[model samples]
Target chain A: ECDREPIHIPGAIQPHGYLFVVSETDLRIASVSANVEDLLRQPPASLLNVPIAHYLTAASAARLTHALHGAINPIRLDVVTPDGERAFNGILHRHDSIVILELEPRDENEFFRSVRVAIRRLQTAADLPTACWIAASEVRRITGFDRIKVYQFAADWSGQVIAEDRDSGIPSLLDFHFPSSDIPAQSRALYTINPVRIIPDIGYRPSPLVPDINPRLGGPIDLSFSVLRSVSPTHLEYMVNMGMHAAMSISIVRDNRLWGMISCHNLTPRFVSYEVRQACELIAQVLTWQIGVLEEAE
Target chain B: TECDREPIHIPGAIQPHGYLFVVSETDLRIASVSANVEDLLRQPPASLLNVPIAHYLTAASAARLTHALHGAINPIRLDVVTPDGERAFNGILHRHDSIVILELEPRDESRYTNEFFRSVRVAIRRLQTAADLPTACWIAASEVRRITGFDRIKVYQFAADWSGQVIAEDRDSGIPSLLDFHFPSSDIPAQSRALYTINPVRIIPDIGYRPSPLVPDINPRLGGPIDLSFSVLRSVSPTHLEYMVNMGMHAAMSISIVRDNRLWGMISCHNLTPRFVSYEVRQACELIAQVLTWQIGVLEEAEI
Candidate 1:
């Protein structure tokens, strides 16, 4: 039970974005992040049980509805907040019989160009280790992180860095190895389904979800796929144990197995836009396929 | 190789195995051509000067080459009028960054397309069954020699210092064995030329062959010797020719093993007598070299 933190239902998220848990059957807001008071200019308690349409622009609400049936990611949405119309990248998903929607500021416009270049460079790598190096370098190039490391798991699930591309000043972790507990089984399982996780600033406070529990599910809501889900306290402390202010990990899963990760770290606080994070995720997937090409050759 | 003062890219000449034609991108006329084009096409070098490419091309061939200017065709089969009669030549065409280059070679007798594919398929099946890198390379040495009719085949591996050793070999008994023989770093000098990443396959039919000079020896537009870095018939350096002569070898062929655009090793074929491997056969050997490179990395990475 020591490392059995049920991180999937954290009951809160990083304060940078707002999380809305709504009813799948009635489209009513089931819960909202407590920090929503200053954002929508309404108390989180009253925002609950309200129709999602009241907060979203008519066009955006309808577009999000159509998007939920397809690629439920980064749907550009406009919200009628009291602070004026706000543009956000709406990440929507259906989990635990409820629709979970997370919104962060739309922070990038050049997503296509950056990702196109990264993908082409990743495709030309001739072997597994070379692919790992290209992925680390390309991910760091796209995200501008202080350090990028490619990790591979041993049979015991402990991981070690296989390749690295980092800024000159940052300490190198090209030889660092972490025990399996450093990335707990539960955390690794989450990476199997959610390919990307980022903590823009590790020093931030967690914004609690209103009402403490979902009325229907009658327990903590599952933030498994939530873009802004807060990290485990044990895990956040481990990240701070390293000299990092910002961090991100994109999963490298192959054949439905959690292979490893392209881990990004920064010496100073650096916010990666959703676009750049997606680009790193794209490169990680390419590296996974390239590694599989060699593994299958044997 | 102490005599390696001349640059190979601007050789100003090519081997007589093929006729070279460099056409201007804008005008599409002959900017530079091998002087021996007269011997094969029976057209004087002066007659072909500034002559539009359309003069020797039919509408279809011209259309095919026009597409090849950007990258479309591969080893274009074109019938050209030789002094003997009209014969088909393999037109290797590509746009070398501002100018068009087209080299012609006699369609060698070894290209039975469907049968070549079957042989390559069988070779690959046997190669994959090998349990390790050395086993795979040994299989490759024998299979490629069988495919290309070479007197000897060796898997030459380079160390971090650029020196090489024969890791595996299959050869005729009359030829001296070179297996496990280490070679000097100066012998390769692939980095000095900086052209290893071109086509994976390079072949020299005869080491003692005469060089056919480019008509003007310098491209008019380029205002210098033409760059023949990727041309198949570009003349070899005299130093390398002399080295082959001292080895008692008359011809040589090498298929590059490149990983991540780095020249990792080479599958080198040596001939005691004059031999010319065809475009299709060399292409087949290049495929074998790539699979061998893959097998090498597979075992190397597995140990990690």
Candidate 2:
């Protein structure tokens, strides 16, 4: 019922935000967006294998749990870390095997600030899709998140990232492009249980590598990614071996169905407090309402 | 009835238009509303009293007999002497009464004009005061014919199938009366109603009245008017009078009536001469007809 893949590292220098889909039985990495190394002291390449709790302050963890249970649509929470916990909001949408988290770090950035205004204008006119696009662009402009796009999940656990808000003049921001392997089942289950998933300072080393009791259950070939087993030491070794630092994510749900998520990453050591996460969750709810309005129009 | 009818002789004065009203059983005067009655005529207010309305009616007209009928309301075309032959005029009454109130003069005086329209309405309202049906019917019909100068004016009551009975005929009409006559059910079938709906007026003038050719050979103990209702449900049977109508007849107007939501009666006006009536005149006639039919039904039921 569960499939866990051995975390693999394609390269050490490619700093990227790692996505892990976890369920009761297994744990697996869903995807990694762009590698952000400019702002964070270290790139995501060095943060592999780090336990999510390491990056998430106790308050952030608790807030994520509360939101996972109470949230019906995309949720938002503020998470402050290296720069200080800031409001970060995102949505959780569950596909068949994966819970896609789409997140946006809320701050007083000029691009996002203008987008927020645009979103309000669109809402006043009841222009849903426009608002969704503005919101997606706002999130992408700040977080530099990949698939940093507006994704629509159908009744099935399948979807397409329809609109993209990437760097200006970015040539290959495909209008309608998404991989089928983007969300696996186990990832969605984990989203159902926990709203936030963070792996901060993935380079941290543990005293010892615990033996895998359900080795066969989460065998490398297992695509389910259902295991909750800690991120593999080998992956952590891979991140430390590189220079990547942290990751933060939240789930997005629309009408009780896991729609997707809003996730972001930092290259240096970063941490988010519980209060910060709650604030972000509130922001996420606002964005989710905007996006939901757009989806309904379609 | 003859004594009552004799003094009321037709004046032999040709009236451009003439209308009648059956006011009451006891009061049989046609009050003349003239401008000079008090001055040149040196006549008392009562001078117009019992002046014998027949003095102004057309001679040899069947409307005379129809009007004399005690219970039936009969309206017929006749002439009255008017300063201008082209002026339109009308009168009103109750079916069971003899008094008729003259209506205000209409502007256009012509053989064919709807001048009798508005006054006819007033006549019905007046008759409604007496709560009598036949009387009101007669008064309204006479007013309608005179104003329109129709040849033969008859109140044709209908059966369920649109067949009609000439319950009342005009008094001054030279045409023989169809008194108490019943037309066959086929005479006015459904199709005929549609035609009437489109053109409520039809005319056949100058054809000297010849009795229906289909009259029975034997006049078996006639108790009432013969039922010369209809020949065929759908066929257009021409009456002998049709010949006269074709000879340059102006127009004939008919006002339909419904009693108890059923086809009840119609005021059929025949114009011997070619004529035209105004819309106002037509509307007035229609309204008067409606009121008369209602009132007449009430009296008819009471008599029954």
Candidate 3:
């Protein structure tokens, strides 16, 4: 009963992006999500047990390995897909015994340029509320979510929607307070580790990992740092009850702690590009700093 | 687990200003220690390893430590007399991974000043009535600058994203103003910020001091590198050292201004020449920060 919701080791992923686990020592594809065929044009069975070099160019594989060893940073690259070359943004990180590689379609240059503008606006805002309003409005513009909100955490961990921007006809949730129990303690811990979580569609099926148990760790691989880690069932159900077709959250951290979140909601299924999510992460960071100054002022 | 992540916990060494010892919980025997402990305690670490901690600590002090270990949530701070009878030491001990790590710093018991307490009382009274945030912080910066006599003191407030600005400053004639300048978030790495919340005040008496290595060349508790997150004499990160040198600062001390257990900002004191404060003075400074935190809280609540 104590292990009821082991959400961190779900061993599955939402289907918007593809995920693969690579053995650090042999550079072979150890496990992959079931939806790889939609993005890579190859079935999951064909990719497993094969060298990652078979899919990624030699140069790309070497760069990824170097990154994995050097601080486990994320890198953006262009890859050769079945339909010519396409842009891809990928993050590589160590997970128990193997490395997890999460890849998503890259955003166009215009999206990045506009996000840069959002960051500048956030930096110059006079106070926290203005900064959050700018963040909500700018993020809604960039991601085209039906609604975007700046949710702030109170001292006791309960939260309220302090700022919001929504499409006309959408019901408002501004100033609505949600209890801390709405997000479990473990889920909040994961937010500090990964900082971003996305579910492209509430009704989509979860793609499970090919091999549930990791050979090296002798148990389920911890997906604490996985970009494609599946959403907790409770979180999925909460969104479904709210009539949300899709949702995403970017963490706002302060003093090395999870301060709040930038929550996005769409009435229909939606997918936000990796670049835009990264941009929103940066904007949230700046917004938090602004909040610090504003809170100090009062 | 020696990966490329920020090794802020296992810096492999400590500054020469203090001595550290790791002792097991079951037997209370010394597990590992900093190399400089021999110079401070007159007993080489090799002889001390596995020796019952009762051999050094006074019987009453040892009992107090054990009692504190039973359930204390925070580090226990107490005064300990050295075995050689030549010095008094300030000791801080806390549990980590089923082991008790103790740090000792030599202190001059006679250095406690009456003027320091008077100044602290005055600062508290002044801060209590501050009309606004700017007034409150300006008073704090001025009081700490007067107390520490640093070349420059700044009320460095961190933004939500970790970027910081010098909201208020008090400096000597030779030092120029750094007020209102933005510092990039990268100045303090994530791990370093996490450590700040654990240990509220970080003092680097001198930036050029070499790191004193640990004895046995390994951490006994984990059979790996030791976690120095709570060590008072932990060596400064190289990036931070370079950052200080770039700013032309020779010594630095930061007092954390924490709100709701989160690092709110810092009262950062800097000097162009090496500066060392007695343990008593640092304690006084930390108390003043607590007073300021209370006043800030009251003011914010009143406004609301």
Candidate 4:
């Protein structure tokens, strides 16, 4: 079952983020990830069948209910821990008959001027190679990754590292060629749907979703768009072999086609802030547009 | 007020092949018309503007346009006469926001044969086994050329900014290669791009054909004017026609390649001489484009 990777519908998440599956009609907790206690200070078993409103402030609960009406796009909500000591930022979206909410501790300030400057530089680059080079370097500036490479796809599925920017201590994979098998077909499809994917730490254990089976889906939950989807075992093995502890990839979609990828690597386990990832995604789009123009000009 | 929507859907003009009129649902009067209406109808577009369209359309054709407004009638073909000659015209009627648009184009007798379809099916089967994207695109372009017999067929893919690049091309010996040349997004315009969603294939049998004018000019229904945003036979823009003439192509057809419901690219076919492909052949090309799109997705996902 080579295709039975189950990367999507994983029924698990990384330990850093908390997942909650709530019934759409009643707004009651149906399933929660095992790591909820670490963030919410409430045990997973204690949250079963409890009304979601019981955990959130009255205003936040009302805000979530109103946001659920048309929840195709993920919305941001502010929530407080059970004891009201710490606040967390939550990302919420609807899935069929259930609502999935993932939360991470709020840290960085919201800002984008620097990101805009980097993206403008990327847009003004004279040619495709220069645009790609600017893309790799700008992504590293914002993401602070040890190394970044702009991996372009050939006529065939194989990819080549066409441009790179790396810190002095990091080894270079410049001009490296990776086989098509390295990234499976399903994974490639996912890249088009969810443009940014991050693996903060390879050493962390997967936090399995509570109840194992989703009451709504009747099986493993589909985490195709999950911000905290657990890493696949095969991919984890590949990363271990490469001696990389943290990684992230942003897709470069040109004219709705998957043109290439901006791959980021770190020598030590690194956590990229959501703000940085968002900026990087916008920059990737700008770079893709500029590259499109340059390719046509050539 | 003049229609102010980017001039994409409301190009004041259309291709010369047919006439376009916007009808008021309130009064059934003609609200707007292409500028060249006078030559075909003995009345200039300004004379017909704001007049009842029923003054010119036969009771049957007028009823058909209105009935289709409430119902789902599209691409309605009718026999109509002009000062020059009696001709067959294909038309489309639809509601755009407030006004109803009636677009008309000269209809051609479709000439699809079962043998042609059989060959196309065979071509699609071969596409299923193609190894990569470039090969699949080339095969699709070749199959389209075989089916349409156009002088040149190119599998064109659009970049992020809507600029197009001819990835694969099959042309006659004397014809120059456009294999690597680029086309700016403004070449198609945003409105034309949106129209591709309504109908995947667009054909201009002859670029120089003059547009016919609608009779009695104004539509009586809406009291004001009509919009032809959904018309199949709506005339082509003069700018686009000029672009084609400068490129030395007298006729052209384009089939949209949509992936995941988004416009991915196009299979653009150009002919140096005036030509027309029957509706059946166009449908065959549409099928090939769809199959090629699916195969591309598969090839991109499958390992080498």
Candidate 5:
């Protein structure tokens, strides 16, 4: 064993955080964090990868089961404490009998809150597109981003910038287009392993891999920093050749496959401090909910 | 003023609620009411007379100025702020038939807390179409731009997947603003858009932006959009602000339209600044949103 002790350090909360991994076959807690007790006041071994039913109420458990079975991808059910409802907010990535959730409860809803806001906005206008535009613009204003745009994609994964609240001083790239092959299946599969991918301080030199010990599987395996490490120099040259510096993208899903991405680009070097990236990912989750509703309605 | 001071309740924070009015030239008259105004606002108007509604304004309010004009029935908005920024509300209405088409700001809004102005958006939309219009709507994109201070205004048509097109654009008003342009399929991607939400006037103020650090002491609830489906109107998340800034946009706002159990188009407002639009702008957007929707429907019905 590496001499590093699996100590439940009290102060530092690392990146990607902890989550509850549930076991489907047996209705028992399957897996959780070594620091689960430090955060949730529960022992790690007892809770790690357990059936979520053990923690959730009966109603919540049943709803969760149904969502797991019936939905195309993973669906989540939030259980509220007397204080407030708590939910597992990250991606519900499944592997064999184990379902790993990247927990981000900082932004979560317990059905009713979302319904209340949605119901009010619904009765106001008759066009779903209008509602969508409103939502997108609202996202821009609230975020204070320079240009939050609406990117429409074709079935084959190619996309166009359909509507844009463009930059006033500079000419807009609103009509600019991108092809499908930009984000391949291999990159999307990484979502199951890491969701809030940030190239924080993107220019920071990647630490060289340690010799002998397979670096890919060792140390703090933070993909946000280094997944692009082994990317071909040709690809990096092409991206730079396209006049891009730093970028962040939110994956939009419809039925199952990776839809297109809500990509925020920067000509200048940009950095998304750890916390804000988490919030954007959560907001993407809500955006995903409405997208699902619209697809089903159609 | 009757000396009936069982606390003499000076009528200040209290305002009239739920009445449709028609403004004919300089005259303002009430057209209809549910007859339960007293129940709604805890008191009643002594009389909603053939008075010029502008006379009640502390200054040249837009809603009042628009009411006195002879145009088609149209929505107008005004902000009412108590001496301090501590309290405020928006008065959104249109005038027709010499009646001041109206809906009062809810009581909670008069005192400006966090949620003071949130729930009144739907009511604002209802007041815009309270009266008849000349075209499907006489609400031009210019009017929407004037009310919201958005640099460029576009009527966005969204596909079933939430992919959208800017079917209409407003000519700029001399002041330097973003270019008005047409974006074809390359802009709205099919897959990415499938997750767009149709409610909440989503606003991203600045494509290039940064997030504010959490006020360590305040309850985290005041922070930002905590979940993906969380309402965009809730508040700007610090995370998203930085993300937009990275993307090269200064500000953006889109209003939702829902029809027949589906979210349709949106009146999108984009600005190239780090902006903070008041709750009043949202009210005006909602009020005028109907006109925008009607115009879109009128124009697109044949094509669709």
Candidate 6:
């Protein structure tokens, strides 16, 4: 019963963003969300059989084309929807012969300076508690969530809140332990790859992937990276039961395995910039490395 | 699993650094006392036993006696005219069942009004200005180390499993720093933590000192040994003393930092030589610990 959730291929994307899968063999849009006409000013059918360059401007198309095979990421695509130019942050990745492009409307700004300052603070800690405390505080700043928790797993898979940073009215759960049943076996495996998952609004309805199946593969697209992938309804109910309206989790990995995570929670609907989420994930990477250094020194 | 060890409340003896006596509210007479009472009081336990409570001093300084008869609080300074001269001590009184146990330790009752008050007042202001919890703890450790002159001071914070690590430390030279070093949760049994809630501060001058057993090993009036869990002179567990011996600490003190009635952490002080803390000094550290909690709570409140 615990292993049946097909979370990665939920056949839908969160309502806040859009996902498009382009065929590598012909450069045609093989599969895409049905609800893109309102943002892009063109129906999903118009783009389905056409090349992606038809919608992207000359400069934007060039940026994405060169990035398709290279190590490039997060190309700036001021997309041309028949109406006009729209700003977007697009992430490109390869899934089989198809190229996956996930797009989110650009938010105000990135937190580069904050990430730089926070990385220095993590290195200054002498132990894991101080490091985790700094991690929670920095993530709280970057994500603008009401609270952030640095959670770790014990030997039995039970979780512990080692450090917590929160606003005034939020409930405090520092030093509290949660039962193992809260995180099942399947969810743990997903966290290793889809490290940064955010649900902007738990109560909002989602947009289904149009045509049930991809034109090229006759199946749902696999999520090999972070994106606006829809979550499990059971998991959505878990957040509502926790009095949370929005939540984001960034994995802390060491030695190619799950070590822990930085969990961000808000009482109201929240939207985090793509730049900011990447920054928080970067902080987690540095935090995990520092933890490794401390434990090895011990 | 470790919480099931031997109970610590009925140790039946106390450290030799002070005197302890429990007076019966029913008979208004001394019920039991430490055998070393003669050294501090200039009279043997026989003179104290069977004596009316009024004769020994239910003395209240009335300076800061806000409320009594429940838990640890401000100690009432008592001065007694013995055969040799006038003796002074700080008297801490708390009621257990029908008896009020009074612990007396040698120290001038007077607070250095001008000097000590200014120091404590200044430290709170400095603590209020800290930018974060870590900075606040470091400032607290430094201020407490300055006030008590202990060789080392640490802000020990407990984790989920009750294991503690030194989050902040300030120390003098020559001792190995325990900063960031962890201590297993077994060091403090469940019963000991229960005692820390009521007793705010405790200091042990010499861990190796022989305990002075109370006269009449068992109190007939009370039908058993007095529960010394809240007693300042309660002899600590031998296992803990051995642990301290291994750490090379002859003197140590722990001041509890509690929030919302649960023990959050402790301010630990250690020394390489024997050092008896005066009651007034311990009272000062008690305020420092309390102030540290208040400031840390505020910083962790906004949690920025």
TM-score, every prediction: 0.54, 0.26, 0.49, 0.49, 0.37, 0.49
What lDDT score goes with residue B135 in model 4?
90
- Between 2 and 3, whose lDDT is larger? 3
lDDT for each of the candidates?
Answer: 0.78, 0.43, 0.76, 0.73, 0.43, 0.76
lDDT of 2 by residue, B233-289 (tens): 111223323533553343455666765555577787766454555434554566556
DockQ of 1: 0.01
Q: Top model by TM-score, which number?
A: 1
Residue B273 shift from truth in candidate 3, angstroms: 33
Candidate 4 lDDT over residue span B1-304, tens digit each: 1212345444334665556677677767776776656666776677877788766666787676667665413356554456776556666566765767766665535343323434554575567668888899999999899878899999988889988999999887798899978998777666677778666888887888776544433434544323445555556676778889999999999999987777888999999988877544665687678768777776766764
Local lDDT at A108 for model 2: 28
lDDT string, candidate 6, B9-57, tens digits: 7888899888887866554467788988777567777777777655544
Name the lDDT value of residue A90 in candidate 6: 87
lDDT by residue (B138-162, candidate 1, tens digit) is: 9899889888888999998889888
DockQ of 5: 0.01
What TM value does chain A in model 4 reach?
A: 0.92
Candidate 1 per-residue lDDT, tens place, A101-142, comes to 888878652333344445455546667787788888878877
Error of model 6, residue A276, in angstroms: 1.0
Off by over 4 Å in 3: A1-4, A37-46, A69-87, A109-113, B1-304
Off by over 4 Å in 2: A1-122, A125-128, A141-147, A168-173, A199-247, A263-280, A296-298, B1-304
lDDT of 3 by residue, B1-304 (tens): 1212567777888888777878777767888888887776787778887888766776676786677665411233344456667344556676666567877776534332333444554575567668788788888888888778899988888899988999989899979789998998778767777778878888898998888887754666567777777667778787778889999999999989989888888889999988876555676577667667766777788799
A210: Cα error in model 4, Å: 0.4
Candidate 6 residues lying further than 4 Å off, grouped into runs, are: A224-226, B1-304
Question: Which ranges of candidate 1 are over 4 A from the true structure?
Answer: A109-114, A296-298, B1-304
